[PDB]
Amino acid sequence: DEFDVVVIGGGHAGIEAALAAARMGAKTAMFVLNADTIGQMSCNPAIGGIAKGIVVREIDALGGEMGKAIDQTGIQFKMLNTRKGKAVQSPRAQADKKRYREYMKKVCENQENLYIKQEEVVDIIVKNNQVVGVRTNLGVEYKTKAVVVTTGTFLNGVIYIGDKMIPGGRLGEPRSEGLSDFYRRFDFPLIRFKTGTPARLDKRTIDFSALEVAPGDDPPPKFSFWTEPVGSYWFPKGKEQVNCWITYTTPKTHEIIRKNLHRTALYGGLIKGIGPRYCPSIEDKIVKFPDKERHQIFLEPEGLDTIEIYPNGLSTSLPEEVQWEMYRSIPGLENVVLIRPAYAIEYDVVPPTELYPTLETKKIRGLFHAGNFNGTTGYEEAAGQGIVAGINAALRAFGKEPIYLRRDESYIGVMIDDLTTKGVTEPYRLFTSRSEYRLYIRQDNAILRLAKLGRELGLLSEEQYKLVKELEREIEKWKEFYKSERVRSYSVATLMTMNYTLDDVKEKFGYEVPQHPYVKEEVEIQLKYEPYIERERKLNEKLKKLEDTKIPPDIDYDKIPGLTKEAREKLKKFKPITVGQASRIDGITPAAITALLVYLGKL
Amino acid sequence: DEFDVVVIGGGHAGIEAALAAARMGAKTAMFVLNADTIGQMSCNPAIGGIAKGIVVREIDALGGEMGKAIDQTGIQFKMLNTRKGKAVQSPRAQADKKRYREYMKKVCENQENLYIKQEEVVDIIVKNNQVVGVRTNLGVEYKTKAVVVTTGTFLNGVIYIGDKMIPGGRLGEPRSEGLSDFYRRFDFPLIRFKTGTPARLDKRTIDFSALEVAPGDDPPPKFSFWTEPVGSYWFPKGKEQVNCWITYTTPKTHEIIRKNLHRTALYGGLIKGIGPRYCPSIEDKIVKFPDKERHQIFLEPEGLDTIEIYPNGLSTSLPEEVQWEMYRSIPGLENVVLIRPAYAIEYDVVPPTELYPTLETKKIRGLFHAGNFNGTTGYEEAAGQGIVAGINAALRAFGKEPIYLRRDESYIGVMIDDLTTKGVTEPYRLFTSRSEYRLYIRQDNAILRLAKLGRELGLLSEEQYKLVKELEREIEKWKEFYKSERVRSYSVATLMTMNYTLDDVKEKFGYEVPQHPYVKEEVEIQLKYEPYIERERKLNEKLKKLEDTKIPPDIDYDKIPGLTKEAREKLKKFKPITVGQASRIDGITPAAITALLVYLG
Ligand SMILES: Cc1cc2nc3c(=O)[nH]c(=O)nc-3n(C[C@H](O)[C@H](O)[C@H](O)COP(=O)(O)OP(=O)(O)OC[C@H]3O[C@@H](n4cnc5c(N)ncnc54)[C@H](O)[C@@H]3O)c2cc1C
Ligand SMILES: Cc1cc2nc3c(=O)[nH]c(=O)nc-3n(C[C@H](O)[C@H](O)[C@H](O)COP(=O)(O)OP(=O)(O)OC[C@H]3O[C@@H](n4cnc5c(N)ncnc54)[C@H](O)[C@@H]3O)c2cc1C
């Protein structure tokens, strides 16, 4: 039959995209190679982290699932980097791979207008650069208005272990092959990225005696402003949480890796690294920091019913023989046994630059990319892209105009922007990026920042938006209050900026305090941070000014006065939507930008 | 008339290349836009540093000048990173920009077979992919066998200040334009890199009262195993040295820069950094490190007779008005005045991958690139490339075969390899690279490691090689000695590994201290490190085994069994010379490498 939107992929990106596009009312066909793998978590057994955490909340705020999901199936939540402030924190729960998968799968089945299909999409049918359909490897064709590609680590994937190559997209699964011809056919740049993962350990064979413990936090935090408790962002003290364990590599582990560097496809270059704990393979951790003698390693539970341990911080592509020797050089694992070997995955990727901040292909209309296929890596980073892609894919199908998240309003917008404008040299991660609005884009205000875009599209219930609209309205009342009261003589509001929690203001000064968990921790923040937020908003006024100046999708970049010839072209290939964006293009200089502003400064 | 080798460039790359190519006996035409700028130091007023230092010694050991140069014209030497060991140290002297320039200039004039030319080369004449000549912007042509391009920051250069563009290759100088058409004509990939430099301050307007002092070291070190004292690597205590001063930025400085990031072509990349002390601009240290509140700044003397201060760690491309406000927000510079504004330079560069480890273009025979035109940045990193390029350009001209420095024998080889094999995304620096033989490629054994390649080519005097061959032969004798003597009863040799300097072995155990200065500090090292050096040599045996397996320049990468089709190609475009090298190519995997090793058997 026919479809409005076809989502090639059942992964994280696929889901969010498919769900949204459907929830917005589009007949959505979500293709998958193996239905039983819908929502499968293939690497670290956790959702959230430094930057990731924030993203989730946004996806949640927007009406996506990833939030709700990790919550109901999480087995160990906690807030990271607690000794710095509330704005610079981020939630990172542990997950039950099994239950998570089942969850997401269940949702997709039970979602109106979302039809699942287990056929490998091989081609994209295009008439005059407009998506018209999709064709599977079973000689079947389908009529669709929009397509959202999210192949992740599958397109012509190759598993690397030792010096062995094995066709596939994930250890044990097949791979996709056909769809790449369509891409080379139309001349999209194709490049390959390869990432690694740690093997899987036998819990039974590990010695958890002389090892630290990383419990969750009580009360534990929650990734959704929709789960129970509703409207809140926390779990009632006393929830069941599992424990992770910590061991460290040793001088011997290294000598082992070193001895076999010529046997691993993850032996990157010898360049002074960004940080011991920013590098992927454990092979880098010793190539880039030839002076550190031990790196932290997180043994993580993959679920409740499983004896499978995840040795976080130990991904590699060393021979399997070697993989044993080195896993057993670690304290606690001297007798461990592997259930699945660690390995490396290489896969086809189409440079983000080939898209607009709407995630729509510049060359073809109706085609949207997202996920690892977009140069990213991580469940979250991928999820973020999906929802945007899906939302737009929908609108594109519906006959409306695509939307986009500004880099100064959602940490997602940041990613999508850093991607469609600066491209990628290696897999793009979030805990690598920074926001020129690190204080306005917090891990809490998220719901407030995006909730409206939500209700606007439909991804958010009418009733849902009111709880937000209502909760917020109240957050400012309580603030206008502390602003007017006094205590020299300062304002209670002005107090939060002096290590004054709305809890010390209730005791030391016997004042009232908000009676809804969110409004209290929210009002407490906004007031403690309102100053710094402004200094920040100010130091960027100029930047925002640009980001606010729109550039027509028709202007001829030649009719532009005193605009270098070289830049005339980059400006035609990126077709920036805002002057600000146009200024972030590498090559386009302040000089060029002015000459451009002048042009527009007549029109 | 005609030439064997034409060296387009009078910069550092140009020099070493030109000098060598000529010293080896080739009619060498070294072209320059402005003769008075031969050997001009355009950025930091110093030679050496973390990685750089070592390179120099190598170029010195090979017969290049840069070493000798910095020595006789240096105004403040010193060894960096002294609290870690002797192998992990590196010499970094301050220079007298003026004196240095004059020096190198002098040398080139007085060098047999080296003819200077102040004409802008515009084209390279090629018949059947073979360099046959060069053509200047004056409608003149020249017959040459080889060409060594080293345009540095000039090919279609553009100076950026605030939002102003100014054609040129350096503040105040012109630029090159024509030569780039030759490159696009033949399909070379052309990309642009831009770097920045700090302005220049009026020494008279600075307050050097409440600021630290960074004197040289006594005795100070020397970058040449040829200057005085000969054979040694040290200067007799008591030499004249200048002093640098240290101030730090302030929270205000930053708010200034921040306020003006929309007016500086150097702002970009919210990516987390590798350390503040590693970024170029100062507009970075406040974008990549939004939490640090003060960065060290080294006020450095540009010479003896000059009142020009170099604010190390403050390069920027901010408007000139802003440049004032932010230079005057710094402690000591509240009243300073600028002589030259700081700025940014953007310039044409042809991706290194377009060359072999011999620095010869893959597409055209007889054409060699080097310097910043090759994706590099820095006097040293550029110098290193030149000498190799020149050496080969020579041999190519002479009708012999090009040579190359292996990555496990010279830190230079490292650079050249990191470049011709992994290409560049941004300007390549040395203090960013690491060597899988950090202990065997030290800042002293250099002379020993390369000396022979030197005499082999001619760049080193016959009598020069003997001093080396002789000094070395003696370094081992004295070792054979400490190895056999005892003390339970360990060996004196085995003692150096226990914080035993051949100085404590002369006092505490009344033994004999070596003949001359080098043999003493050398034997003292080699013995203190002989262990670690071996553990290292071993952990890499496998890697070297590959690096030793040679790949014929003829083999059809198709006739190779079970070698993925995608890799068949990359292996065609890099035409690796070594299997080891072939393994460093991004894309070529251990899988592919084995399938290859099988083929070759
Ligand atoms: C080996 C390995 C290493 C990793 N390393 C890291 C890391 O270092 N850091 C990090 O953050 N994350 C890492 N990850 C996580 C990775 O980012 C996610 O696993 C996932 O691939 C990203 O989400 P996605 O939605 O793009 O794709 P996926 O979740 O992988 O889903 C892709 C889906 O597309 C379908 N598909 C593929 N081709 C076709 C086709 N032609 N037709 C129809 N359907 C198709 C598949 O069935 C699959 O369901 C790693 C994963 C692996 C497997
Ligand atoms: C703005 C700026 C920023 C810098 N930043 C850094 C930094 O961050 N870190 C660092 O280590 N170093 C930095 N440097 C130093 C720089 O790397 C060296 O000055 C130089 O580029 C390296 O040596 P070279 O021989 O390749 O080129 P150059 O020293 O530039 O010399 C090239 C020579 O070739 C001649 N020439 C050019 N084109 C032609 C032609 N077509 N025909 C004939 N002759 C020609 C010129 O006259 C010139 O003398 C910077 C320099 C500048 C100017």
Swiss-Prot record, chain B:
Compartment list: Cytoplasm
Keywords of this entry: Cytoplasm, FAD, Flavoprotein, NAD, tRNA processing
Listed GO MF terms: flavin adenine dinucleotide binding
InterPro entries membership: FAD/NAD-bd_sf (IPR036188), GIDA_C_N (IPR049312), MnmG (IPR004416), MnmG-rel (IPR002218), MnmG-rel_CS (IPR020595), MnmG_C (IPR026904), MnmG_C_subdom (IPR047001), MnmG_C_subdom_sf (IPR044920)
Cofactor field: FAD
Primary location recorded for the protein, binned into one broad class: cytoplasm
Binding site for NAD(+): 275-289
Any one of the GO CC terms: cytosol
Binding site for FAD: G9, G10, G11, H12, A13, G14, V121, S176, N372
Example of a GO biological process term: tRNA methylation
Subunit composition and interactions: Homodimer. Heterotetramer of two MnmE and two MnmG subunits.
Family listed: Belongs to the MnmG family.
Role summary: NAD-binding protein involved in the addition of a carboxymethylaminomethyl (cmnm) group at the wobble position (U34) of certain tRNAs, forming tRNA-cmnm(5)s(2)U34.
Protein name per the record: tRNA uridine 5-carboxymethylaminomethyl modification enzyme MnmG
Lineage: Bacteria, Pseudomonadati, Aquificota, Aquificia, Aquificales
